[PDB]
Symmetry: D2
Subunit: 248 residues, 4 copies
C-alpha cells in the first residue's frame, strides 16, 4: 500500500534540507510533488531528475509574495490537475542579536516569510482544494522547535513561530465551522542535520538534545506522510513535535 | 506494508474500543500483539480468533496490580520471545460528581488505574526491552484530551491524565539521559465512538467537536503505528493529539 | 497603597476599556501614567482631567508607527523624566470572515497593530530604561486568550496574539542573557465588559465563561500593578491569565 | 488598606522556606494564618511566636492524611471562625533515580504527597468555605518548575506536578459550573534561595536560571497575596509562574 497514492502535494522550500526529505517521503508513498524554492532553481532541477518529471515539478516561488502563490497553484493544477496537500515548509532562521538593536526591516522580513507566507499559502491551497479536490485536503505548517542554538532569544523568529502555531489552530477551526473537510496541523522539527555549523555550536547544539544527536530530514518527512494521508482524518488543529525530546 | 514487521507489542485494554483498534492496525502492519483486559475475557478470545494464534495472545490483566504486569511480561516472552512496544491504553472513567463529594477511594482507584498503572507498565516494559530487545523500544501512553484541558465532570480523570502526560516527558528524558534508546510518547484521543449512548448526550458531545463527529478506534491505531515503528525514531517525550479539533 | 510609588508608566490604548482600567489602578497606586490613543483625544482628556494634570499625561499614538514610539517616549521623559513600565495594551480585532477570503491588507493591519507594535514598543522602552532608569524596568504585553487557543472568527488576531506570546518569552530571555534587569511578561484577558453590545451576543459570550459573567477592566489592572511593581521582580517571561476560567 | 484584611488562610508546609515566605506576606497583609508541618514542629511554634498567636496558629499535619485535614479544618474554625484561603504548599522534591529502578512504594509516596494531598486539601477547604465563608474562597496549588536541577527526569515528581495542574483546572471548573465562587489556581516557584548549599550545587542551579540568580521566599508570597485577595476575582483555573524565566 502506498500511503499517498494519487495525492498531489505542494512543498515549499522543497529542494533542500528538510523540505527535500519531505519530498522524498512523499514521492516514495506515491504522491505527486510540486517542490518550490526562491533562489535554488538548480536544486529544483536535481529533485525533478531524482524523482522523475512525471511525478515531480519545480516552480520558482517567493513565499512572501501573494502573486507567486497563484503562480504555483496554477502551475500545479496545469501539471497535475489538482491540489490535495500543502506543506508550508519554507522559512528563514533565527539570529542572536539584541532585541533593542533589531531593525524593523529585519523583523518584518522574518514575519513576512515565517508567518504571513503561511497565511497566504493556506488561503491559496484552500481555494484550490475547494476548486479541484471536492473541498478536501490537508495543510501542514512546519516550524522548528528551535531555530537558534540555546535560548530562543530571537524575538522575530520566536514570534513568527508562535504566530504560525495559533494560525494553524484558528484556520483548522475557521474551516471546520463551515463544514469544510480541510485539516490544518503544525509540525515542529527540533534540530535536523542539514547545514553545517561551527563546532562550538554543533557540539553546543547536541548538548541540548536529550537523545544525543540530531534528526535526519526524513524524520520530518515521515510525520508529514501521516498528516498528508487519510490516516490522520481526525487529526486537526494539532501540533506534531519531532525533536529528540528537545522541549520535553 | 509491514510497517511493524516482527515487532512484538503489548496493548493493555486491547480487546475492545480504542485498544482493539490499535491492535487491528498493529496486526495489519505485521506486528505480533498481546492484548490484555481485566474483565472482558470473552472479548479477548474473540480478538485472538479474529487475528490468529500465530500473531496474537490474550492475557487477563488488572493494570493496577504490579504482579499482573510481571504476568503479562512472562506470557509475552514465552509466546513471542521479546517485547518491542508497550501501549498503555487501559483506563477507566471515574465518578461523575461534585469534587468535594468525591470519596478518596474513588479518587484513588482512578489514580491507580490511569496513572500508577502507566508507571508500573513503563518499568516492566523497560526491563523486558533491555533484556530481550537490546534496550530498544517504544512506549506509548494513551492519555486523553482531558490530560490537556480540564474535564469538569471528572477531575480525578483529568488529574490522572495530566499526570500520565508529564510521566511521559519524565520517562523519555530519564531514559534518554542514560543513552537508552527507549522512546516514550503520549497520544491524546478526543471523542471516539465506541459505545451506545443516549441521543441527548451524543448531541452534547458532538457540539464540542469542531468537525462535528466522533473519531473511530483506527484513528488512534494509525498514530500508534507511526509511534511504534522506526519511522518516529526522533519523536520522544512528545504529545500526539487526535481529537478532530476539540482542544484547538 | 503606593504599590507603584514613583514609577512612570506608558500605557497604550490607555483611555478606554481595559487600558483605562489599567491606568486607573496605576494612578491609584502612585504611578505617573502616560496614556495613549490613536483616535480618542476626547477619551484622553477625560482621563487627564480625572487623574489630575501632574500625575497623568495624554499623547496621541499609532502603535504601528515607529516614529510615534519616539514621540511618546520623548514626551514621557519630557513630562516625568523617566520610563519604568510599558504596558502594550493597544490592539485591534480584525474582519470576522472566512480564512480563504481574508484580504492581505486586513491580515497585515492586525499583525502591525497587535504584534509588530509590541516589538516596536519593546525596543523603544528598553532604550528609555537603559538610559533613564539604570536599565531596570517592566514590560507587560497584553495579549489575550486568543493567543493561547484559536479564535475561529479571527485567525489574524489569533496569529498575532500567539506571536505576542512568544515575543514575550524571547524578549525576556534576550535581555536576561545580557544581564539586563528588564522584565517582560504577558497578560491574557478573557472577556472583559467594555462595549455595550446586544443581549443575544452577550448571552452567548457569557455561555463560554465558566463563572457566568464577563470580567471588569480593573481586573486586568490589578494583575498589571503586580507585574509593574517590584513585588514581581522574579516574575519573568511568564504568562498571566485572567479569564474567568475561559481556557481552563 | 491591608490586602488580605480579615481573611483566614491555611498554609501547608508553612513554617519554613517558601511556605514561611507566603505566611509572612499574608500576615503583613492583615490575614490570619494557620501554618502546618509534618515533622517540623519546632519551626511551627517559632512561626506562631514570631507572628503572634492572635493572628496565627500552628497545627501538626501530614497532608497525605485525610484525618489530619479534618484536624486542621477543625482547629482553624475553632480558632479563627472561618476559612477563606487554602495554600497547598506541602511537597517533596525529586530524585535522579532511574525510572526502571523506582520502587512502587517510593512512587506512591510522592503521588500521595504531591498530588493526592492537593485533592484532599481542596476537598476539605471547599467544605469549610461553603460552611463558614458563604461558599467564597481561594485555593492555591503550589508546585515548583523543577523538582531537580537538570532535565525533569523524576517520573513521580513530574507526574504529580502534571496531575496537580489538571486537578487545578478541573476543580475550578467543577465548582464554577455549580455557581460556586471558590477559585482554584496554581503557582509555580522557580529556584528559591532557602538553605545553605555547596557552591558547586549553587552554580549548577543558577546555570538554569536566565536572570542569573535564585528568588526569595517573599517573591512567592506576593503572587499568593494577589491570588488570595479579591484583586484576582476573575482569575481562575490559571497558572502563575514566578521563576526568573526558568521555563520561558
Amino acid at each position: 500500500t502506498d500511503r499517498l497514492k494519487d495525492k498531489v502535494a505542494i512543498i515549499t522550500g522543497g529542494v533542500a534540507g528538510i523540505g527535500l526529505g519531505i519530498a522524498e517521503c512523499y514521492v516514495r508513498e506515491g504522491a505527486k510533488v510540486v517542490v518550490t524554492a526562491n533562489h535554488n532553481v538548480d536544486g529544483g532541477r536535481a529533485a525533478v531528475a531524482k524523482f522523475g518529471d512525471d511525478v515531480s515539478l519545480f516552480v520558482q516561488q517567493d513565499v512572501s509574495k501573494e502573486a507567486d502563490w497563484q503562480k504555483v497553484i496554477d502551475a500545479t493544477i496545469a501539471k497535475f490537475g489538482r491540489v490535495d496537500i500543502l506543506v508550508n515548509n519554507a522559512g528563514i532562521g533565527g539570529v542572536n542579536t539584541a532585541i533593542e538593536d533589531l531593525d524593523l526591516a529585519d523583523w518584518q522580513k522574518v514575519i513576512d516569510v515565517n508567518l504571513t507566507a503561511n497565511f497566504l499559502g493556506e488561503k491559496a491551497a484552500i481555494k484550490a482544494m475547494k476548486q479541484t479536490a471536492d473541498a478536501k485536503g490537508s495543510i501542514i505548517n512546519v516550524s522548528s522547535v528551535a531555530g537558534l542554538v540555546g535560548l530562543p532569544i530571537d524575538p522575530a523568529y520566536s514570534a513568527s513561530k508562535g504566530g504560525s502555531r495559533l494560525l494553524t489552530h484558528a484556520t483548522a477551526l475557521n474551516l471546520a465551522q463551515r463544514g469544510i473537510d480541510i485539516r490544518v496541523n503544525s509540525v515542529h522539527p527540533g534540530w535536523i542535520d542539514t547545514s553545517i555549523i561551527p563546532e562550538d555550536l554543533r557540539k553546543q547544539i547536541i548538548a541540548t538534545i536529550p537523545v544525543g544527536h540530531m534528526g535526519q530530514p526524513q524524520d520530518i518527512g515521515e510525520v508529514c506522510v501521516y498528516l498528508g494521508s487519510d490516516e490522520s482524518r481526525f487529526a486537526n488543529g494539532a501540533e506534531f513535535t519531532v525533536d529528540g525530546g528537545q522541549r520535553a
